[PDB]
Design a binder for this molecule. Structure first.
Ligand SMILES: Cc1[nH]c2ccccc2c1CCN
Ligand SMILES: [Ca+2]
Length: 223
């Protein structure tokens, strides 16, 4: 997260870190057994880390649970990033509490102008590289479909939306991949892609979660 703020320990209780020897992506806890992330975060050997603030220190609220199964969306295209969503099932159920909690799925899509919270352990620099230990947060509005398409000609599908600031300076970044965009207490987006980070006229692009609720629910119901 570039241009954000320190969230505060465990204030984003649905935020997970995906770990394969190191943090490599975010995700969102959606029930005691399932996490939603980006398809571009797929790899084998994932341990889901819940209850994290400092990802380099065991602070006492963590739960570390290995994945038993990952399901990349059937229509994910890794060249265009269309349908950039994946589900991860935990080998055991997380113990839910005030600091480890699921985030509700949307019942309706969110409109341009809606304020959202984007979070993660990604790079905090738009030029150069610095990776934080503690969770970073950014409040950002959803941008209009027309401004999103104008920013990224030929690339924005109906499964994507932009959020952030056309002036630059505030954005998600590398390592925030797969993490949440939460608006009014609902998971509306997944950190998906963009041209650099925090660049003028290049806002972040996010998977449009509301399009996937039926797939998420039916997948959970049979897996
Ligand atoms: C999700 C993601 N991962 C990256 C890796 C390198 C540069 C930009 C990005 C982005 C977009 C950030 N808005
Ligand atoms: Ca920790």
């Amino acid at each position: 997260i570039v241009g954000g703020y320190t969230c505060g320990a465990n204030t984003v209780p649905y935020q997970v870190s995906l770990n394969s020897g190191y943090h490599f992506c975010g995700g969102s806890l959606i029930n005691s057994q399932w996490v939603v992330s980006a398809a571009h975060c797929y790899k084998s050997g994932i341990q889901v880390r819940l209850g994290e603030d400092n990802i380099n220190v065991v602070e006492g609220n963590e739960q570390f649970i290995s994945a038993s199964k990952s399901i990349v969306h059937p229509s994910y295209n890794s060249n265009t990033l269309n349908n950039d969503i994946m589900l991860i099932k935990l080998k055991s159920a997380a113990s839910l509490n005030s600091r480890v909690a699921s985030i509700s799925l949307p019942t309706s899509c969110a409109s341009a102008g809606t304020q959202c919270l984007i979070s993660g352990w990604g790079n905090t620099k738009s030029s150069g590289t610095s990776y934080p230990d503690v969770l970073k947060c950014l409040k950002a509005p959803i941008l209009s479909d027309s401004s999103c398409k104008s920013a990224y000609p030929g690339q924005i599908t109906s499964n994507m939306f932009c959020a952030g600031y056309l002036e630059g300076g505030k954005d998600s970044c590398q390592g925030d991949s797969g993490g949440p965009v939460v608006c009014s207490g609902k998971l509306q987006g997944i950190v998906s892609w963009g041209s650099g980070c925090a660049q003028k006229n290049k806002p972040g692009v996010y998977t449009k979660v509301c399009n996937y609720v039926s797939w998420i629910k039916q997948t959970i119901a049979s897996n």
